[PDB]
Design an enzyme around this catalytic site. Sequence first.
Site, PDB file in Angstrom:
ATOM      1  N   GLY A   1      -0.174   1.392   0.279  1.00 52.72           N
ATOM      2  CA  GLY A   1       0.866   0.980  -0.634  1.00 52.72           C
ATOM      3  C   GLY A   1       0.462   0.291  -1.929  1.00 52.72           C
ATOM      4  O   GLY A   1       1.333  -0.004  -2.756  1.00 52.72           O
ATOM      5  N   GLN A   2      -0.822   0.011  -2.138  1.00 59.09           N
ATOM      6  CA  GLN A   2      -1.201  -0.577  -3.420  1.00 59.09           C
ATOM      7  C   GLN A   2      -1.064   0.469  -4.532  1.00 59.09           C
ATOM      8  O   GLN A   2      -1.071   1.671  -4.265  1.00 59.09           O
ATOM      9  N   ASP A   3      -0.946  -0.013  -5.771  1.00 60.60           N
ATOM     10  CA  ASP A   3      -0.474   0.771  -6.913  1.00 60.60           C
ATOM     11  C   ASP A   3      -1.172   2.118  -7.099  1.00 60.60           C
ATOM     12  O   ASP A   3      -0.511   3.171  -7.168  1.00 60.60           O
TER      13      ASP A   3
ATOM     14  N   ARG B   1      -0.065   4.331  -4.355  1.00 58.97           N
ATOM     15  CA  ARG B   1       1.364   4.551  -4.493  1.00 58.97           C
ATOM     16  C   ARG B   1       1.598   5.760  -5.404  1.00 58.97           C
ATOM     17  O   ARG B   1       2.370   6.663  -5.081  1.00 58.97           O
TER      18      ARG B   1
END
Lengths: 159, 550, 139
Positions: A53-55, A58
């Site tokens: 889920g980190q950018d 993502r």
Amino acid sequence: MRILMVGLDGAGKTTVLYKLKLGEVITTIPTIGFNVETVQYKNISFTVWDVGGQDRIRSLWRHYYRNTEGVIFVVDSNDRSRIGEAREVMQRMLNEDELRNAAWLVFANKQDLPEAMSAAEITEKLGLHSIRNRPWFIQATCATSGEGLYEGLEWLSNS
Amino acid sequence: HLEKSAVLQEARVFNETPINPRKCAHILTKILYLINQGEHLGTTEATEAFFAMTKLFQSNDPTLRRMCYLTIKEMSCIAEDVIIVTSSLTKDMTGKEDNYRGPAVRALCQITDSTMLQAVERYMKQAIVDKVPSVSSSALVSSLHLLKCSFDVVKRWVNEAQEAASSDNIMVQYHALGLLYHVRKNDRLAVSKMISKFTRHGLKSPFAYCMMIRVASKQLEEEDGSRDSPLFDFIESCLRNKHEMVVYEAASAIVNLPGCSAKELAPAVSVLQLFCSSPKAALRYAAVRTLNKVAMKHPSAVTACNLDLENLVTDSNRSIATLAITTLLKTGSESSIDRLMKQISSFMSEISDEFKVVVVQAISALCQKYPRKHAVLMNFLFTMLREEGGFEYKRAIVDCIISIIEENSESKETGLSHLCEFIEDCEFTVLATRILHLLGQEGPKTNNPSKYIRFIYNRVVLEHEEVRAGAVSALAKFGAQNEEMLPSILVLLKRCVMDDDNEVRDRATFYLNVLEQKQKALNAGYILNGLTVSIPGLEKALQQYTLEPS
Amino acid sequence: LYTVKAILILDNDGDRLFAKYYDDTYPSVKEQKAFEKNIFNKTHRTDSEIALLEGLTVVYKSSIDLYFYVIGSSYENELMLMAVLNCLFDSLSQMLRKNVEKRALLENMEGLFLAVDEIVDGGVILESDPQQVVHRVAL
């Protein structure tokens, strides 16, 4: 059954997956990538794609959209600052054509923490009531205890 | 065999749910085939195929793993969002079996960049120490690639790399010492410590010896602190193991730049080391040679001579014969030149085509390089002119002429004149340009210019523009330098040939008008001898050296 | 770290049945094929363990319809190069389950691709043990 599990970083996605696969609570590192695993529940074999889920990551989920029968969206119920951001990610995810008919299961997670928002609160903040085009469900979970996890697999299997 | 578009396309199903190790592995094989057969991938479909494959890493099958390593390296540069595959490679890399171990490190490290460098290190340290050559060598070559992305990570591996160095296993050592030399380098001295540790040892690894010889070839006396000798107790200066390549490399450096001086069991100043290996089979090629040697290539030259000279004369096989000429060339020198020239004369008889051009060039080239007189060089240059008559070229007219005006010019023109009698227009633009340029420039009083003029006059008619233009301008300079000449200039220039063709006309109109019409301040000034258009070096001899045993 | 310039296994014309370039000097098909035609023309119809082409020692062998190549440096000799070329022939033979001809190679294009990559790695000689290569590769 093919499952895509996403959510912001630190929501508990990998903890959930390996609790389900190993009955164990592992010591996670941030997932730069995915984990993919197969889990047996009641005659269904769920192939779960846990995508970090980190950018940077993502930005990559869209490659895992296609062929997805169901979507697990994990939320950290204790993090109130990022709930809007979760709402924003999830809303445009709902607009994705490859995700068009996929079953939508929200996990409001870390329910074990004293100030965790309730599932009802989360339902209001994520705008879940406004989904009329497909199946949705929200489930309070604690991935460390295992609470709500199989209730999730249950709901999902009834797509 | 295949179509790149169809195969790059059908790969996209992996990206979704289907993983099917058989189907995907086949599709991958097809990708490798498209490259191998010789085709070029299309970028959109490639980028798509790359993101799709990473899903396939989940299924662990040794053939599918293998396909995946070659395909990601080939597709890595013509693909996007490749970073996802690092994790999958680490997962594979830790999995025990050489199929995964070695091939993964190599695929992973190629894709790996300085950010990613850190990740691969635990697995890399485990893979480098292996005395199982696949895992260790792949990890050692992999580290070499990684020195680029990030130096520092690789450097830490110097201890694991050294550990591999202590193997006498050929790969593990070759890779270990070779890589180390590149890695640990921060100054000469630290590398030198690495080399001295292995240096005293009588390896059974020819490759390690070779890679190391090269590091070693210069005098190193700071190996592991200090030592009192350039000593290499591994064949470089020693001859602990015999094997004709290693023996040759070592023997040519040591003889006149000691890596160590001569030992009774390891010649290293004396000419011997090459020579004991010298009578042999195909193998002989390294053995028979020379280069440098004490004090000259010539006492050396005599040993080996039977071998090089019989193959060179007998074999009209290209493959043998080439080794034989290179070997003759190597045993050569200033002294050797008498012998070298007869052999090279003889050689064209075996292979005569370009090889003919080369021997007539070689005999001249050798005479210029190794002095048997500058005159003889010209006489050989005549033989070159005679035999080929066309594989001389433009660069030859400039080189022959410049070289010639050191001594030969009156003779050269005259020889050239005779040479011009050959063939009216098949002799080429160049010979006509040489007799023309030389007759213009010298302005013969050594022979009557009338033969030269008569010979050139015919050649111009039926040969290229550049010579006909050359002929008018030369004539003009020829006018300015010698008054006598002017009457011939006029009969030649009025003709439809030496003027009034095309290029020939334009130059002529100028050159003529300046001679005819104008003061000839200009014409006078212009002739300083009537020299060439440029003065290069002596091009032929080096050209000839490589060209003959090809 | 460098010995082998390139490995080619060529039909009896010099055309690319296979080549895998352990040099960076041929990546485009036109030039990879030109190289292949170049080395095959010198070396062929005179079988020995030596050829000199392009100032590099080229070691080669032949079969029914193929000539098999290692190109390496000429500061070496045939025998060092030959050890790579013997591995190349041998490993393909044992791998494919049939001796190297155009037919064996085409029969299993995958075994051939994988087997050669284990033998040479970016011009360094990665492997030279035929047996090791064959176990290392999975058809």
